[model samples]
Target chain A: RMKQLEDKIEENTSKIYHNTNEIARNTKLVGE
Target chain B: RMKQLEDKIEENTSKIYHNTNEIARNTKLVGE
Candidate 1:
């Protein structure tokens, strides 16, 4: 139970972080 | 200056939101 939750949390957090980083990086494309 | 940033922000936000929803929905696969 808890193990799967922990795995899912890790997976989801990584995805969220990647998306956030991508969002930040792409905005720079509008300029430089 | 601010215009494209606003646009990119909106676009990126939507993408992130969609990804977030998928992540939310995916975790449930471990159960139902």
Candidate 2:
């Protein structure tokens, strides 16, 4: 198993993951 | 694939699969 590759995947993947949650949650918070 | 009618859920898995490469997807949408 390539842990480093896995993390890279997550890094590139989650940079947007957090952005997704960030933009998504902000909308939810603001939606309130 | 069972070809078991390949229901909407099967359709869903594919969409997500492509979208996983879709790091390019949401990232572009929310990217820096």
Candidate 3:
């Protein structure tokens, strides 16, 4: 397999991980 | 961030993202 698998898997996984953070930030923003 | 954010998702993302080369190596190794 090429690097795409690793990059995409990494991206999606990071997106998911970051999504939690983004959600938290948004939630806090909502609270303010 | 959630505890798992730093681990299961983020950690894995960080780890495996670098492993792109490793995976490519392995894939090529397998091909060879």
Best by the DockQ measure = 2
CAPRI quality of model 2 = incorrect
- Candidates ranked by TM-score, best first? 1, 3, 2
Q: What i-RMS does each candidate reach, in Å?
A: 13.5, 9.3, 16.5
**For candidate 2, what's the RMSD?**
9.7
Each candidate's DockQ score against the native complex?
A: 0.07, 0.08, 0.02
- For model 3, residues A1-32, the per-residue Cα lDDT tens digits are 54555566567777666655655554455452
* Model 3: CA > 4 A from native: B1-32
Stretches of candidate 2 above 4 Å error? A1-9, B1-32
Q: In angstroms, how far off is B6's CA in candidate 3? A: 21
Model 3 iRMS (Å) reads 16.5
Global lDDT of each candidate: 0.58, 0.50, 0.56
TM-score of each: 0.47, 0.32, 0.35
Per DockQ, what order, best first? 2, 1, 3
Error of 2 at A20 (Å): 0.5
Using lDDT, rank the candidates from best to worst.
1, 3, 2
Please provide, for model 1 over B1-32, each residue's C-alpha lDDT reduced to its tens digit, 9 standing for 90 to 100: 65565565556556667976665554454333
Q: Is candidate 2 or candidate 3 better by lDDT?
A: 3
lDDT of 1 at A8: 48
Error of 1 at A29 (Å): 35
